[PDB]
Write a protein that binds this DNA or RNA. Structure first.
Ligand SMILES: [Mg+2]
Ligand SMILES: [Mg+2]
Ligand SMILES: [Zn+2]
Lengths: 40, 83, 263, 1114, 222, 94, 15, 105
DNA sequence: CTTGACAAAAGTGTTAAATTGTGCTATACTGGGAGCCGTCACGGATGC
DNA sequence: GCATCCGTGAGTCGAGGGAAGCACAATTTAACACTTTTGTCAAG
């Protein structure tokens, strides 16, 4: 978000979860799409 | 050993964060029998107790920073080194 | 066991579960003193065991206990702490908060990236304690209690109140929130610009991050109170400071539909 | 303003009555008009004949007839007094003493049956309600494939809901057919034996299919006596009970052969006969006669299963979602089902009371306790899922509500347990359920609408009309046929060309079992009545529907239900043809019964002198408040002395203009971006709309207060409220209620009430204060009703109900109730939501002055500016075509009717535009004006864009642009032309019920919850905003530890922190450090109530008391 | 007796207690069969148990008998009038000593409390308890104004003499939390009862004079 | 964007330390009534009121402007917490 | 029936 | 005083459960149907869970904070803050032991 | 500041009236009653 | 391996939705005087 080395004390775990799940609604649902990610 | 996100989260060392996710009865029954102690490491445990999360401005790395101007800093140093 | 405004009494399901256990416990004591046969004692002991089960965890074993005249299961201690409506997810991990408002959002094209259009009447209620102090500082009201009365009636509010409010919010920021909050850019801090009307004005460039268009969307307004909360919002959460995406590192506030077309 | 009509399809039959799904079903159930001897065995008459007679097993209570009385109060009174519109029900029963042989007859009052108004709704406790029809699986016998094991089928016998258990017939791998009942599986031979079936009898029928019969020919029980087999079967079903022939027979007889417990239904029985090729004597699986069990449906069910498994050509599986396998339970059937439930409870009380207490001296009145029956009826009409608060924002809202079909409710699917299969558009939906109209979201496919031409038949199956085609010539004979019957024919399309009545097309587009096919005229057997029968009433109100994407046409039809009535409402310039029928069939307008003359016309009533000479006076509903607050009033449309023919309009209702549905205004629209105020669906409007009162609506709010008897004393509604100046009491009358016509703003008193203060000694500081000022404390306190924040208007009505008033059923302890009606005239403002019929919706984001809007060269400003960027993604091209036709009609002064899928085409629209240019540009030439310099500049750019032909004169190129719907538009701010021609036209836009006035809400402090002490939720409760888990994550990701901590403690439930934070702020200080929330304390005590020792420790593991020493025993 | 507030097994256990009593009191000399005599006690125990355990807010036995009789009387009038009787019909039916006011009071007394967990709406996410404010704990505005009043009064009493301020702070219970009578205050300062009433009246009068000159304390009086 | 935010972010190793420094300094300014400011009279933030230009009441604005000047010292374990408050009280009595 | 308390009681009194 | 750094959860013994309680609940009575006051020995007893209004006993003999931490002899209700009524627990003495369903099912 | 008489308020019995709690009824009676399928689909964990 | 039992399924809002009686002993409550305790008045 800043194009510079991460600062000590950042909640990278929450950022990782939010980044992965945010585009979840854009994944196909119809071994592919969101169901593929969930089993992975 | 490889386990999924659900099983990896439920087998965490903090019963507060595990009890608030899923299987509250199972998590609490095992925590009670073992007499588990929660050290309040993560974010959910502190949010539950209304404490300051150990991240961002609540992290120990930055949380104890002190700000002081020159005029007061000289007074403190002068008032101490003179003796 | 509280009395509602109308005089009716409302109580929780725990009192019913406690009463059943006490009624059965007392009856067993009477039967034991009477030297009842083992069949009668066994039935009461079995009932007492089930009464404790229902109190601790209703419906886990056998048919759930229901309130007479209805089919709704009684809420037990386990049901209180478990589920999406339990204490954890409903009251501990998330709460309802004061100094919060809501309204429909419209597009403000004249705003700067770090500004929002906050209605005057929303701002009056959100910043009420700050306003009462400022009114008392000036000559608007003699004391905070007199000032609070003035705001109670709409026709009693003078025109100097709005001038004082413009001073209260100076420099301060507010948090705009749109649900669902998929990522952290779903909450952003803006410097309110008091506007006439009832809808919040949103900058065009922050609509993609909020995922907010203007076909009926609504947003929540929150006021950080202390100096830390204001410093954190103005430094870390400010809209003009979060220009790249935390997920990919690419710009997240960038030209959009009508802007691209003109350029 | 003449109306020009488009289309070539000629509808041979008109739309059926749009509310007959409600009105007809309830009449059949009640049968309140047919004489008792002519009543048929349907509705509540069948319910009486099923439960009765009641036999003691020496007393028999018999049922002879029932009747319904006149309702105690009229509909208007019921709404005003919060009553239910109902008719008393009397049953004439006769008690017969078998021993002595005496009959005593008397009429017993059974209770009250809610009555249906003329429009098809109910008044339950003074509120209009609609019973939504439910769609479910039809009873009958169905044969589906086994998913686990290919080549194996399962036979299911489905009774009416809550009218018996499901029976499943399966062929086990071992070869023995198993019957599963109540989750218990067992061999059908045991049950089949009980029905008097021997070894050779089965072989005579089921032996000609293969080895399957071998598994149903076990001699281990064939030699067994049926009486022993019955006992054996009873043990299998419910094990443990003492086996007895009297007990075993009763359980078996009532399981599958008791008409009072098992009911296959009229639809189920009809489906079973049609499928199994049999004729059922009754509606039960087996019949018990001559002291033995007789089989009815089990044998044919097993014959079909074996034959289907064998592979006989004539037997096939069943599609459960097939609309011939799904039926509709209308209001009549739903009500009768609850009537039978309550009437069964009444039978139980009679049986248990006729065997105890003065057995010789008994009368039908003593035996019958109607409380169980009334409770069943009142529960259905109040606490049912299908009984819904009527939607009456406008006349179309309530019409749609009555035609909605719901798969949910008692006995239906669950919003979360329903999969894709139940939500799909089945091929049999064609002509019976609208494919577009549905709720987008979690209820998509679960709530739908009846098609325009569809009607539910007697058995509950939706039928649709088809024209009989014989020899290639289409006749006017219309046949209503269900989905199962529709599958046997080739059905052509309504748009097939005809030369008179003969099909002219050599190749005809048809359907064969839902599959499109190309056939010759001689192969066609039926034809569609019209394209309208495929869609609902809402979706038939969208012109140019064939050009709209279905996802957006779904929004367009749903939004029409949310449009508010306007004081200056207008019928659309482009209509489809259903506008007049919607208003007529909603019963909101008023029409002449027959030929006559108008004698008195007024704003309150109309008097008509009919030709027969009788005078009829029609009161007009004036400024009435609907369920949603919109004002519903009828305005007279006739003058004294005017002759009116039968059916002529007398008064327009809400949202109608001369009998046409008028849900909005006709505005001049420019489709172009505008300074970013069109951004992302926002809309720009002119201040000229407000000046002439366009989109101005009247809304009424009701405020209610009560005076109650209390232990401390009675609450009094009085004008003498303590410690109130004369400014606050200015508008109250001597009785303490605000005077009518008074303007009330937030904080103003509506009704003045005083309550006795609970005796509590004042705090020492307040006691010193009172002593200083020498003021004696009063015993009563102000508890009056004030206008809430963001509300107000003009007081138009006050209703005062007192204890003892006729029909006023107040609660115990309530002395009186005062209701105040406050009406406000709402003008369009920034944040209000506007929409058109083609799914385009947005919020007003800017109101410009007239001199800022783009204007035509003649000086006409546009009214609304729409962003073109909303069209390409949405693919709703109907709004563009409507705008083009509106532009042509704007200059020609006419309106148009283009039926959906049969209407105006671009070649026809462009000929109208060619005419409109002559009036639009021909006028200018006569006035002495040529072509503007600014228009010549735009024409030069247009020819570079390929929009106009090079080498033509300026006038010729202006006409070329006009035929495309484009004009040269000038900028109101600079005066220079927009560099390109703009699509300007006239569009019909509706003002929706969602207004920012009812949605803006803010809070600093207010009510808090009882247990958790957190702020309440909801604008009505003055509650706070929910900071859910996902919002907490965002602050955690931001690193805002202190912002997050405040919301968790100081602003939500830190009782000490929130008291200190507020006091710190009003003193000019910074808020203090927060403490433990009160929700964590609740959690610790709740965990302790579970016998769990939760302890908070410190760095050294020593206990830390978070309860401040208030819970430690010394 | 099912459906009257107690479950089937609860009724049986209450009936069993009546059966135990019947065994003790039964007399076989009379030659009456046991079920003839034991049925009285079994029904008596079951019926009493309902009157004592069927309601969250227990109502005495006599009041339950009145409530049941009142409900029976109304139902008979309801079946004969073809409509719900008014409190006047019911009062007249009950007999002497009954009026419409008493009938309404009895019906108000017989109202069961409503559960705080009753859902409202189709969604199972809203309950009665979510709409009931807590009106016991003071609100932040109430607590702040109480501290503001105390703070201003402390400054106002500062203008008073050292003893005069103390007398008012005692006579009004500003120190011990409870008022002290003239004699009780006098013992503290060793002065007579009549004298204290003089200084307190004089000290109170002075506070009135100051307030008129500033009007800094009239807002808190409402 | 806050003025000089790019320069402020470059004065600290962790962005969350800047919030702690600014938030703590703002409280010092509030507690002493802005009498301890290291800003010259011509540098004090001002707000436009109807009567005229007055000092900015927002202390977070004062703290951010002071940090840009470079006249403030921040870090960990600078001076004892108890001694710092005592010394500041003497210099700027409030 | 073990899961049914009433059936279990009725069985016991039937002995 | 000291800050909370850990939270421990453990089984509670019958002895510990009796140390938590301020008294045994012996009756199923909640509140009087006429005066609407809590019933003695019931689920809402003031002598167990605390006073309903601050510094005021049930008998109405103590009505001020002067007698803080006192127990009235006439009624037995402690004269303290009514917020203790959110934190003070009672207990039921079972005639026979009953298993905790969490550790069974 | 200190008495001396003064009427009202608060406090202490004393007793009759409401109110509430408990026991008793004798022909013979002896094992419930509601429900019941678009049963929800999947994956995990345990008992075999 | 199969068979069985358990827990899980987005957010914010919104209006709307709140069938026995009687006889008797015991206990609690309300009325009625009659007796100290408290606030006052006028004085000295
Ligand atoms: Mg939107
Ligand atoms: Mg919806
Ligand atoms: Zn006490």
């Amino acid at each position: 978000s800043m194009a510079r080395p991460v600062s000590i004390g950042e909640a990278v775990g929450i950022v990782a979860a939010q980044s992965i799940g945010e585009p979840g609604t854009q994944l196909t649902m119809r071994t592919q799409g969101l169901p593929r990610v969930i089993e992975l | 050993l490889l386990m999924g996100v659900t099983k990896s989260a439920l087998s965490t060392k903090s019963w507060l964060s595990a009890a608030s996710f899923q299987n509250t009865t199972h998590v609490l029954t095992e925590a009670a029998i073992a007499g588990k102690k929660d050290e309040l490491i993560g974010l959910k445990e502190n949010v539950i107790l209304g404490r300051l999360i150990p991240a961002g401005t609540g992290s120990d790395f930055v949380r104890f920073t002190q700000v002081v101007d020159q005029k007061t800093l000289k007074a403190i140093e002068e008032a101490r080194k003179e003796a | 066991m509280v009395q509602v405004d109308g005089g009716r009494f409302a109580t929780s399901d725990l009192n019913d579960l406690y009463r059943r256990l006490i009624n059965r416990n007392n009856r067993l004591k009477k039967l034991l003193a009477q030297g009842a046969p083992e069949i009668i004692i066994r039935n009461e002991k079995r009932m007492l065991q089930e009464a404790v089960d229902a109190l601790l965890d209703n419906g886990r074993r056998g048919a759930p206990v229901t309130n007479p005249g209805s089919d709704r299961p009684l809420r037990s201690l386990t049901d209180i702490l478990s589920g999406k409506q339990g204490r954890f997810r409903q009251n501990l991990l998330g709460k309802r908060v004061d100094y919060s408002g809501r309204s429909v959002i419209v597009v403000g094209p004249q705003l700067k990236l770090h500004q929002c259009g906050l209605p005057k009447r929303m701002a009056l209620e959100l910043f009420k304690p700050f306003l009462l102090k400022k009114m008392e500082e000036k000559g608007i009201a003699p004391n905070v209690k007199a000032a609070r009365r003035m705001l109670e009636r709409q026709r009693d509010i003078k025109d100097e109140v709005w001038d004082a409010l413009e001073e209260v919010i100076h420099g301060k920021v507010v948090l705009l929130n749109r649900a669902p909050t998929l990522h952290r850019l779903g909450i952003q801090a803006f410097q309110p610009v008091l506007v006439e009307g009832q809808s919040i004005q949103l900058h065009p460039l922050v609509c993609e991050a909020f995922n907010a268009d203007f076909d009926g969307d609504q947003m929540a307004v929150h006021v950080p109170l202390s100096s830390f909360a204001q410093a954190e919002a103005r430094i870390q959460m400010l809209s003009a400071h979060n220009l790249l995406s935390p997920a990919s590192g690419e710009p997240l506030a960038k030209p959009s539909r009508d802007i691209i077309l003109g350029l | 303003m003449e109306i020009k009509r488009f289309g070539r399809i000629r509808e041979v039959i008109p739309l059926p009555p749009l509310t007959e799904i409600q009105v007809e079903s309830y009449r059949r159930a009640l049968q309140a008009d047919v004489p008792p001897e002519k009543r048929e065995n349907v509705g509540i008459q069948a319910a009486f004949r099923e439960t009765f007679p009641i036999e003691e097993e020496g007393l028999v209570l018999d049922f002879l007839e029932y009747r319904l009385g006149e309702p105690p109060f009229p509909q208007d009174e019921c709404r005003e007094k919060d009553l239910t519109y109902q008719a008393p029900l009397y049953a004439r029963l006769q008690l017969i003493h078998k021993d002595t042989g005496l009959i005593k007859e008397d009429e017993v009052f059974l209770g009250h049956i809610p009555l249906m108004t003329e429009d098809g709704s109910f008044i339950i406790n003074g509120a209009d309600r609609v019973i939504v029809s439910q769609i479910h699986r039809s009873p009958g016998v169905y044969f589906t494939p086994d998913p686990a094991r290919p080549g194996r089928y399962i036979a299911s016998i489905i009774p009416l809901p809550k009218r018996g258990p499901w029976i499943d017939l399966e062929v086990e791998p071992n070869g023995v057919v198993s019957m599963k009942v109540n989750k218990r599986k067992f061999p059908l031979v045991l049950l089949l034996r009980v029905l008097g079936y021997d070894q050779e009898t089965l072989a005579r029928e089921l032996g000609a299919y293969g080895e399957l019969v071998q598994g149903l020919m076990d001699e281990s029980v064939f030699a067994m006596r049926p009486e022993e087999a019955l006992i054996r079967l009873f043990t299998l079903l419910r094990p443990g009970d003492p086996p007895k022939r009297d007990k075993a027979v009763a359980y078996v007889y009532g399981l599958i052969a008791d008409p009072r417990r098992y009911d296959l239904g009229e639809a189920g029985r009809y489906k079973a006969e049609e499928k199994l090729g049999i004729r059922l004597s009754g509606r039960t699986l087996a019949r018990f006669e001559d002291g033995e069990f007789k089989d009815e449906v089990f044998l044919p069910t097993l014959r079909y299963l074996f034959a289907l498994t064998a592979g006989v050509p004539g037997h096939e599986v069943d599609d459960i979602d097939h609309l011939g396998n799904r039926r509709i339970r209308t209001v009549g059937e739903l009500m009768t089902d609850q009537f039978r439930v309550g009437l069964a409870r009444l039978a139980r009380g009679v049986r248990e009371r006729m065997l105890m207490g003065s057995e010789d001296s008994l009368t039908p009145a003593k035996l019958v306790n109607s409380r169980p029956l009334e409770a069943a009826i009142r529960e259905f009409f109040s606490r049912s899922q299908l009984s819904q608060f009527k939607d009456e924002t406008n006349p179309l809202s309530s019409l749609r509500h009555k035609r909605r079909i719901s798969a949910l409710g008692p006995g239906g699917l669950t919003r979360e347990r329903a999969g894709f299969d139940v939500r799909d558009v089945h091929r049999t939906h064609y002509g019976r359920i609208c494919p577009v109209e549905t709720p987008e979201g979690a209820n998509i496919g679960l709530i739908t609408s009846l098609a325009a031409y569809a009607r539910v038949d007697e058995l509950g199956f939706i039928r649709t009309p088809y024209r009989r085609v014989v020899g290639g010539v289409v006749t006017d004979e219309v046949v209503y046929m269900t989905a199962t019957e529709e599958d046997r024919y080739t059905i052509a399309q309504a748009n097939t060309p005809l030369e008179g009545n003969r099909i002219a097309a050599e190749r005809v587009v048809a359907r064969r079992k839902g599959e499109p096919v190309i056939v010759s005229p001689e192969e066609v057997e039926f034809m569609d009545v019209s394209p309208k029968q495929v869609f609902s009433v809402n979706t038939n109100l969208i012109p140019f529907l064939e050009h709209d994407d279905a996802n957006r046409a779904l929004m367009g039809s749903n939004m029409q239900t949310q449009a508010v009535p306007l004081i200056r409402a207008q019928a659309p310039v482009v209509m489809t043809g259903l506008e007049e029928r919607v208003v007529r069939d909603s019963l909101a307008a008023l029409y002449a019964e027959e030929d006559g003359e108008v004698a008195k016309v007024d704003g309150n009533r109309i008097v008509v002198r009919y030709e027969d000479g009788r005078l009829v006076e029609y009161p007009l509903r004036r400024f009435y408040r609907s369920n949603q607050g919109t004002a519903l009033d009828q305005r007279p449309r006739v003058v004294v002395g005017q002759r009116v023919r039968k059916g002529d309009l007398l008064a327009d209702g809400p949202a109608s203009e001369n009998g046409f549905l008028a849900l909005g205004q006709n505005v001049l629209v420019a489709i172009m971006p505008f300074d970013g105020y069109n951004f992302e669906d926002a809309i720009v409007i002119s201040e000229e709309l407000l000046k002439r009162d366009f989109y101005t609506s009247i809304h009424i709010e009701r405020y209610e207060i009560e005076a109650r008897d209390t232990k401390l004393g009675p609450e009094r509604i009085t004008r003498d409220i303590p410690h109130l100046s004369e400014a606050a009491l200015r508008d109250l009358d001597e009785e303490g209620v605000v005077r009518i016509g008074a303007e009330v703003k937030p904080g103003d008193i509506l009704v003045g009430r005083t309550s006795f203060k609970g005796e509590s000694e004042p705090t020492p500081e307040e006691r010193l204060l009172r002593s200083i000022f020498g003021e004696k404390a009063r015993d009563v306190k102000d508890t009056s009703l004030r206008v809430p924040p963001g509300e107000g208007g003009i007081v138009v009505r006050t209703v005062r109900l007192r204890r003892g008033d006729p029909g006023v059923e107040l609660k115990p302890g309530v002395r009186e109730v005062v209701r105040v009606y406050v009406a406000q005239k709402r003008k369009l403002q920034v944040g209000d939501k506007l929409a058109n019929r083609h799914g385009n919706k947005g919020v007003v984001a800017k109101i410009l002055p007239v001199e800022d809007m783009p204007h035509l060269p003649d000086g006409t400003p546009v009214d609304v500016i729409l962003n073109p960027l909303g069209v390409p993604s949405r693919m709703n091209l109907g709004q563009i075509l409507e705008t083009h036709l509106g532009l042509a009609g704007y200059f020609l002064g006419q309106r148009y009717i283009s039926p959906i899928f049969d209407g105006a085409k671009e070649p026809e629209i462009k000929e109208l535009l060619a005419q409109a240019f002559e009036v639009y540009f021909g006028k200018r030439k006569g006035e002495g004006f040529g072509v503007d310099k600014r228009e010549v500049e735009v024409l030069r750019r247009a020819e570079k864009l390929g929009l106009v032909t090079p080498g033509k004169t300026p006038e010729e190129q202006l006409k070329e642009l006009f035929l495309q719907g484009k004009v040269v538009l000038y900028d109101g701010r600079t005066g220079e032309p927009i560099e390109g021609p703009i699509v300007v036209g006239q569009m019909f836009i509706m003002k929706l019920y969602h207004m920012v006035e009812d949605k803006m809400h803010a809070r600093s402090t207010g009510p808090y919850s009882l247990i958790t002490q957190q702020p309440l939720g909801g604008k009505a409760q003055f509650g706070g905003q929910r900071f859910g888990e996902m919002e907490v994550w965002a602050l955690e990701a931001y690193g805002a530890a202190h912002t997050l901590q405040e919301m968790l403690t100081l602003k939500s439930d830190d009782i000490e922190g929130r008291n200190a934070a507020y006091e710190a702020i009003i003193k000019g200080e910074d808020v203090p450090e927060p403490s433990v929330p009160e929700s964590f304390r609740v959690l610790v005590k709740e965990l302790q109530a579970l016998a769990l020792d939760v302890q908070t420790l410190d760095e050294k593991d020593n206990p830390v008391d978070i309860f401040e020493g208030l819970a430690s025993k010394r | 007796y099912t459906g009257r507030g107690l479950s089937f097994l609860d009724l049986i256990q209450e009936g069993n207690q009546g059966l135990i009593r019947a065994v003790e009191k039964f007399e076989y000399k009379r030659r009456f069969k046991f079920s003839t005599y034991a049925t009285w006690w079994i029904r008596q125990a079951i019926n009493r148990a309902i009157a004592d355990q069927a309601r969250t807010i227990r109502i005495p036995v006599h009041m339950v008998e009145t409530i049941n009789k009142l409900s029976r009387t109304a139902r008979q009038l309801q079946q004969e009038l073809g409509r719900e009787p008014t409190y006047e019909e019911i009062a007249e039916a009950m007999g002497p000593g009954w009026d419409a006011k008493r009938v309404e009071e009895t019906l108000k007394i017989a109202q069961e409390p409503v559960s705080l967990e009753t859902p409202i709406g189709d969604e199972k996410d809203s309950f009665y308890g979510d709409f009931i404010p807590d009106e016991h704990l003071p609100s932040p505005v109430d607590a702040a104004t109480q501290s503001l009043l105390s703070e201003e009064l402390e400054k106002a009493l500062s203008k008073l003499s050292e003893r005069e301020a103390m007398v008012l702070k005692l006579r009004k219970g500003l120190i011990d939390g409870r008022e002290h009578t003239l004699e009780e205050v006098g013992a503290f300062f060793g002065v007579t009862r009549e004298r204290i009433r003089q200084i307190e009246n004089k000290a109170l009068r002075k506070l009135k004079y100051h307030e008129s000159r500033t009007r800094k304390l009239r807002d808190f009086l409402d | 964007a806050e003025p000089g935010i790019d320069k402020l972010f470059g004065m600290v190793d962790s962005k969350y330390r800047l919030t702690v420094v600014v938030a703590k300094r703002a409280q010092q300014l509030l507690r002493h009534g802005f009498k301890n400011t290291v800003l010259e009279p011509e540098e004090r933030p001002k707000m436009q009121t109807l009567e005229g230009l007055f000092d900015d009441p927002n202390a977070v604005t004062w703290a951010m402007k002071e940090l840009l000047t470079g006249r403030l010292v921040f870090g960990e374990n600078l001076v004892p917490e108890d001694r710092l408050q005592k010394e500041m009280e003497r210099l700027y009595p409030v | 029936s073990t899961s049914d308390p009433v059936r279990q009681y009725l069985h016991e009194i039937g002995q | 005083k000291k800050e909370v750094r850990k939270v421990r959860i453990a089984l509670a013994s019958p002895e510990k459960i009796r140390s938590w309680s301020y008294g045994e609940v012996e009756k199923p009575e909640t509140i009087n149907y006429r005066t609407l006051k809590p019933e003695r020995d019931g689920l809402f007893d003031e002598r167990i869970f605390g006073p309903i209004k601050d510094y005021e006993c049930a008998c109405g003999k103590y009505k001020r904070q002067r007698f803080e931490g006192k127990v009235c002899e006439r009624c037995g209700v402690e004269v303290t803050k009514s917020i203790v009524r959110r934190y003070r627990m009672g207990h039921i003495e079972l005639a026979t032991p009953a298993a905790h369903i969490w550790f069974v099912k």
